[PDB]
From a paper:
Nucleotide-binding leucine-rich repeat (NLRs) receptors are intracellular immune proteins that trigger robust defense responses upon recognition of pathogen virulence proteins (effectors) delivered into the host during infection. One such mechanism is the use of integrated domains, which function as effector baits embedded within the canonical NLR architecture. The [name]/RGA4 and Pik pairs harbor an integrated heavy metal-associated ([name]) domain in their sensor NLRs [name] and Pik-1 that directly bind and recognize MAX (Magnaporthe oryzae avirulence and ToxB like) effectors. The [name] domains of Pik-1 and [name] use spatially distinct protein interfaces for effector recognition.
Using a host target of [name], [name] heavy metal-associated isoprenylated plant protein 19 (OsHIPP19) as a structural template for APB, we generated an [name] variant, termed the APB mutant. The APB mutant contains the point mutations Glu1033Asp, Val1039Gln, Met1065Gln, Leu1068Glu, Glu1070Lys, and Lys1071Glu that localize to a potential APB interface of the [name] [name]. As the effector recognition interfaces of [name] and [name]-1 [name] domains are different, we determined a crystal structure of the complex between the APB mutant and [name]-[name], to validate our structural modeling of the [name] [name] and confirm we had engineered an [name]/Pik-[name]-like interface into [name] [name]. Following this, we used a coexpression approach to purify an APB/[name]-[name] complex, which was used to obtain crystals via sparse matrix screening. X-ray diffraction data were collected at the Diamond Light Source, Oxford, resulting in a 1.3-Å data set (see details of crystallization and structure solution in Materials and methods). The APB/[name]-[name] complex shares the same interface as [name]-1 [name]/[name]-PikD and OsHIPP19/[name]-[name] complexes. Structural alignment of these complexes results in an RMSD of 0.51 and 0.39 Å, respectively. As predicted, each of the 6 mutations in the [name] [name] generated to facilitate APB is located at the effector interface. Therefore, to quantify the affinity between the APB and [name] effectors, we used single-cycle kinetics with a long dissociation phase, which allowed us to calculate a KD of 0.31, 2.95, and 16.50 nM for [name]-PikD, [name]-PikC, and [name]-[name] respectively.
Author numbering:
A (entry chain B): 28 to 113
B (entry chain A): 994 to 1071
Amino acid sequence: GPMRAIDLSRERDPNFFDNADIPVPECFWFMFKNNVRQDAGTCYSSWKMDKKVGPNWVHIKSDDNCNLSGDFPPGWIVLGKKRPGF
Amino acid sequence: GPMRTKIVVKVHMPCGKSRAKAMALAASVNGVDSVEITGDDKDRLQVVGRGIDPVRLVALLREKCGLAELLQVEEVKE
Ligand SMILES: [Cl-]
Ligand SMILES: [Cl-]
């Protein structure tokens, strides 16, 4: 092993701040280039965002469990997971 | 109510003085309701507000801080 080179259950939380005046976002996202973490943050579940992913600007949809869908440039990926308490 | 949006911008702002200038700029932009600093290196601005043009915000920051990159634009789900 390991079977997975990217395992979100082993990733430290992003560096983020939940703004007091808007709902708490349900997901953590994590962005990788060749399996090396580059950035991480939060996004809503059952929703969407526009995100910089390497040289590209990408529309990313999230499902109810923070699975993310988008057209990422080679070597790059953005993966989601639900935060504890949701 | 009206659609709000969260914008995360990476800004060149290596120290506190530069952060204050970026925060003051962002705070003055029409439709900004809040501005916070985030990131391990304290080089992201997280802005929340109403009807902001993210590209204009970045343009204004770039011509004040020398570098600014849009990272995330997300409507507030509410
Ligand atoms: Cl929040
Ligand atoms: Cl940009």
